[PDB]
Design a protein around this ligand. Structure first.
Ligand SMILES: Cc1cc2nc3c(=O)[nH]c(=O)nc-3n(C[C@H](O)[C@H](O)[C@H](O)COP(=O)(O)OP(=O)(O)OC[C@H]3O[C@@H](n4cnc5c(N)ncnc54)[C@H](O)[C@@H]3O)c2cc1C
Ligand SMILES: Cc1cc2nc3c(=O)[nH]c(=O)nc-3n(C[C@H](O)[C@H](O)[C@H](O)COP(=O)(O)OP(=O)(O)OC[C@H]3O[C@@H](n4cnc5c(N)ncnc54)[C@H](O)[C@@H]3O)c2cc1C
Ligand SMILES: Cc1cc2nc3c(=O)[nH]c(=O)nc-3n(C[C@H](O)[C@H](O)[C@H](O)COP(=O)(O)OP(=O)(O)OC[C@H]3O[C@@H](n4cnc5c(N)ncnc54)[C@H](O)[C@@H]3O)c2cc1C
Ligand SMILES: CCCCCC/C=C\CCCCCCCC(=O)O[C@H](COC(=O)CCCCCCC/C=C/CCCCCCCC)COP(=O)(O)OC[C@H](O)CO
Ligand SMILES: CCCCCC/C=C\CCCCCCCC(=O)O[C@H](COC(=O)CCCCCCC/C=C\CCCCCCCC)COP(=O)(O)OC[C@H](O)CO
Ligand SMILES: CCCCCC/C=C\CCCCCCCC(=O)O[C@H](COC(=O)CCCCCCC/C=C\CCCCCCCC)COP(=O)(O)OC[C@H](O)CO
Lengths: 404, 404, 404
């Protein structure tokens, strides 16, 4: 059918969903579309940042978010050859409360949906794959989508895409990619937590054969990612499962119990560490790109979700200002990028610098952990930690967006 | 009065001058405006790069330029506490001709002008500072300038600004700065060459107090740049000339003879190591920013002039193609940036990495040279050399640009 | 025959000898057996630590030992390509007197023997090589040895093995060895001291071909050790003496006068840099392994003798406590290991980290020296110096062990 509204957010991710309710409490007609059936269809990570806590307290949602199931990671540890080389507790970064949080994306999305659906002007449609844009009169008037019931021409003055790195809307509008980075990947597998370890951990190991990352998998497990170069996993698959198991157990002898029942490669998940940046997030009238669709980043420090959420809150700010001033021009849509540009670019440069440490070249794989140990012992490093984990000042938002 | 041409180039530096004649030999009408009375008025540099040799040989200009006054520099040396830690002969980078050169901008510009003025369709005006842009019918039509003898209203299909880092057309057209970096400065002074030293040198020194750069100043002298942090030269002036002289002679005792007659700071010249990148070099029809006005860089590797010249060559190719096809809109003008983007950005990122070694912070200052040594002993380092000093492939340009 | 006492110490090296007299003044019955004829038979080193001085002045023995012949080494220097990269004066590590000391093991052992022989309950037998343990009634009750006159069945409640790395009692009791490290060796030779050098030196040199160590050999000479990889010595011997001499003199031209008279490999002495750690030093009643037989280490920093002496002091404390308490079970003998474990493991890990600098691999050999320079320029290097050279707190022992 034909339904008309004010804001159409393609994608029900953590960003759009946030952008879903921030406008919903402002009295705007909001429709949020997702192609999936729910938030459980795809696993998009669990670890968050102290920046997330900062934003939740800034929006006065910290207590409501904390009431759900979560785990507080107090610090991050880096080991070299099973010897600790760096330690950083998140509570020393800012005076207020700060901590990493194992908080599943489905649970946070469910909480946001529960809070948002109390507003009648909010409509969330699942199983709705957007097909194209109603680019009419030289501007984006709405979107043509298929609901699965029928075909919808859903019109809105603003159409915002948060479709993630695998965004179809990136090419529906002529959005030019000015940064496409893909150099490494991760091999994820979950194993039962050993009794010698803690559950609330955030660990990175430099070892002889591979580099490892250990995170608190939901349910009392430990979720470990092995860092590999792009195009190296199929070489390992050809080389044989036995060699991979031997090289892993030589590096991490405690994984022997889990690998005793491992005999093949299909228990691992290949995560592609992609990073992207759109040349201009808004270039037409009524269309703009925020979230992972525009500034997706690598999962080092768990900054991607918080970055998307901050960009979504800035976009809600700009959209509300445009509605109040009756000025939703494209130059108003440039404001979102002009405000998030410094944060996003600084974060992306930090991620590039961190990814430089993951080199697996003959001499560089051996000099990287020592380089990391030198870098973490500089007196400046603390500031860098803040640049990577906290927002120095809260995002300038109107007091109307604060929840009570 | 009323002067009508095809191309109007504001700026007669090495880039525009090249763009001045590359189109001039194509048969187009070219007018080049310069505020200075000659090329000798400002000192704009001496050192070139093997990229310059590659570009000259590609255009079949190498013999003509090499017939002038130049000094071939075969290698760059780096020292730590007066002990060499790095060496690189340029002839090993590529199989063709590869060498740095001492070549003053005035003589290169004089050679280019001598070649260009033989074409009747090329005109050059000196002491003609551009004031306004003749923006009419929603597009840039020409420039209003003052010649010192009258007020000229020059009309041309293409108006190209190569004004340099201190560009007046940078704001006449609303051009945005995507990057603006300024972290260090160079204190330049020339001293007579000691008999122990060679003339065709390119030397860098990590010393106790200051880092030094030595280049062959024209006339049998040696020009030295002392690297300082931004805003630190005033502190040095306050502290006194005697302390500065003592710390300089402690680092480099060979400078004693020159400093025997230095009693004040009015002989050193301060250079601001600014690096800039324009968001989009073409944003209006009939106007464009290329060269140092768009992608000015730091003087680490002598890449600035060659980069500007390559941008000018690509711009000449694009402009000639557009004139041939009778299509000089904004879309075709936006091709120069797309064709120079990756090279310019890679060079700027390498410059940022190199400038990271110039830190004067308490702890980082003493380990920075050693880091540099570790950098120069990597197996990959030679590729980096090829990325910094040479061009992998010649510029994709039409055959009529080759001189005979 | 039949000899019955309290303590039987197999081995009369610096550790056991110390524990030989510490218990002797407690009134216990002690026999110390040594297979050698005297303390001059085997060269066991000359360099001590400030830790040794701390231990000697803790027992009120510093003035007695210092009355002998010794050379005070005030500092340790590290050079790279004949240029000093590190300096450390030991007196800045603790407020008390702190220095290294060239003190020949025969001299210290003779002083300890002279102090101990005044006690009639102390008996030392040279040329009495132990052969077996009298393990009876499910526990060790003594030793069967041969004195060169007769066969001695020595009976003692406590039997302590300090036989060293070549321990013959290491396998008499099934002592599990949980760390067997051997990666490098040292080629030792003594040469006449040049007048340009100081005698009391502790010098390390990173050079082009080999790494060198210079110590004050007794008699006004200089003891030099060339660091080599395991098994490389016989490759050098096959390659020829002349090539070895040329590569040595290229690295250290000051050695030309000594190497003018060198024409064979029979002047150098090969020392194997082994480092062992027994899993548990006490596993049954009436037997124990301490000292070099338990925690042998590499000779970097001169830590082995002081570590063995400290272990012997702790073992004497535990043995006296058990004898006074009348409790000499396995669980009270485990106290020595439980108390020395942290110190010994910290020292051994530091030795591993130091030995990592002695790599001779193609590219790693060149970045190792200036990797050493970086680590010595860290803000926390002084804590590492204190941990590697000094003891933070004195060993907790009774006043009865203090000499008067
Ligand atoms: C496999 C994986 C693992 C990750 N792990 C972590 C981690 O451990 N820690 C961390 O901090 N971050 C992690 N991330 C990143 C994190 O998920 C993102 O930063 C976050 O999702 C940002 O929100 P978003 O809405 O922009 O992205 P997404 O939530 O991924 O946006 C995509 C959403 O839009 C919908 N959609 C897409 N296209 C369409 C369309 N055409 N029509 C309709 N709906 C559409 C999808 O159904 C989905 O709901 C991970 C991401 C992935 C892909
Ligand atoms: C002190 C100094 C030293 C340098 N040393 C080196 C070096 O050793 N090596 C190296 O590789 N690079 C060096 N450079 C950089 C190098 O000079 C530039 O990168 C290069 O000239 C770029 O070419 P261009 O024509 O775009 O710039 P420019 O040479 O600056 O060209 C701009 C010209 O246009 C004129 N102009 C500006 N505005 C107007 C206007 N409104 N109307 C009319 N004319 C106008 C200017 O007067 C100037 O003549 C140095 C620069 C400086 C300032
Ligand atoms: C060549 C060399 C150079 C060294 N240089 C230094 C140095 O510069 N600085 C430093 O701090 N350390 C040095 N050391 C190490 C130092 O000698 C030992 O760490 C130290 O002696 C430890 O004390 P210990 O008595 O347990 O060892 P040792 O003195 O080696 O113990 C062996 C003793 O036990 C006796 N013994 C062994 N087996 C039997 C048996 N079956 N029956 C009877 N007696 C037996 C031997 O006769 C000898 O007296 C060096 C060692 C060597 C081999
Ligand atoms: C080399 C033979 C010995 C020569 C010395 C002779 C006798 C005595 C002097 C002993 C000095 C030994 C210095 C050891 C330095 C060292 O590695 O210690 C470290 C130094 O601290 C650092 O982490 C600083 C940077 C460390 C750099 C890596 C050092 C270990 C690596 C060795 C390999 C070197 C060759 C290169 C191989 C790899 C190339 C591909 C201890 O660190 P920590 O975490 O315990 O504490 C921090 C510290 O206090 C600084 O803040
Ligand atoms: C490797 C993955 C990391 C695993 C844990 C991830 C999760 C949490 C931990 C987060 C902490 C990460 C911080 C690492 C330190 C770091 O990036 O430092 C850097 C230090 O400075 C830099 O810019 C370093 C440049 C990039 C270094 C690349 C690493 C080189 C390693 C191996 C390849 C060897 C080839 C080079 C050898 C030559 C040496 C120079 C941050 O720089 P900055 O300018 O942003 O800030 C500087 C700072 O404030 C003080 O200098
Ligand atoms: C220093 C001023 C310039 C002096 C030279 C003058 C003229 C010409 C010579 C130019 C030679 C420049 C080469 C410098 C090395 C360099 O850029 O390498 C780098 C090597 O890798 C890096 O990114 C190194 C990190 C950047 C430098 C960090 C700053 C180090 C100094 C001080 C801060 C110390 C704390 C931070 C430590 C970080 C761990 C390394 C470029 O990386 P890449 O991936 O592009 O290339 C890899 C390469 O093949 C391996 O090295």
């Amino acid at each position: 059918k034909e339904v008309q509204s004010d804001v159409c957010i393609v994608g029900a991710g953590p960003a759009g969903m946030l952008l879903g309710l921030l406008l919903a409490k402002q009295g705007l007609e909001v429709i949020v579309l997702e192609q999936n059936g729910d938030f459980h269809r795809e696993y998009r990570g669990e670890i968050t940042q102290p920046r997330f806590v900062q934003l939740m307290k800034q929006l006065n949602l910290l207590d409501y978010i904390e009431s759900n199931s979560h785990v507080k990671i107090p610090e991050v540890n880096v080991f070299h050859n099973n010897v600790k080389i760096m330690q950083l507790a998140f509570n020393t970064l800012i005076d207020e409360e700060s901590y990493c949080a194992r908080l599943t994306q489905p649970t946070l999305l469910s909480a946001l949906l529960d809070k948002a659906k109390k507003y009648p002007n909010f409509k969330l449609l699942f199983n709705t794959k957007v097909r194209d844009l109603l680019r009419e009169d030289g501007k984006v008037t709405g979107v043509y989508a298929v609901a699965k019931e029928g075909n919808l021409n859903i019109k809105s003055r603003v159409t915002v895409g948060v479709d993630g790195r695998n965004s179809t809307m990136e090419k529906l509008g002529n959005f030019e990619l000015e940064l496409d980075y893909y150099d490494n990947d991760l091999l994820w597998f979950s194993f039962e937590k050993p009794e010698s370890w803690d559950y609330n951990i955030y660990h990175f190991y430099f070892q002889k054969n591979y580099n490892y990352l250990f995170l608190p998998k939901l349910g009392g497990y430990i979720q470990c990612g092995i860092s590999l170069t792009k195009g190296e996993y199929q070489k390992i698959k050809k080389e044989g499962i036995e060699s991979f198991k031997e090289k892993i157990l030589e590096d991490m002898p405690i994984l022997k119990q889990h690998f005793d029942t491992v005999t093949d490669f299909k228990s691992f998940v290949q995560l592609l560490c992609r990073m992207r940046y759109i040349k201009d997030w808004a270039k037409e009238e009524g269309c703009m790109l925020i979230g992972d669709a525009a500034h997706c980043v690598t999962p080092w420090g768990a900054v991607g979700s918080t970055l998307a959420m901050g960009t979504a809150v800035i976009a809600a700010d700009v959209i509300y200002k445009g509605f109040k001033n009756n000025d939703l021009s494209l130059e108003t849509l440039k404001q979102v990028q002009s405000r998030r540009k410094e944060e996003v670019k600084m974060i992306q440069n930090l991620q590039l610098t961190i990814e430089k440490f993951l080199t697996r070249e003959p001499i560089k794989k051996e000099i990287a952990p020592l380089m990391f140990s030198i870098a973490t012992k500089m007196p400046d490093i603390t500031n860098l930690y803040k640049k990577l984990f906290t927002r120095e000042f809260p995002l300038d938002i109107d007091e109307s967006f604060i929840f009570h």
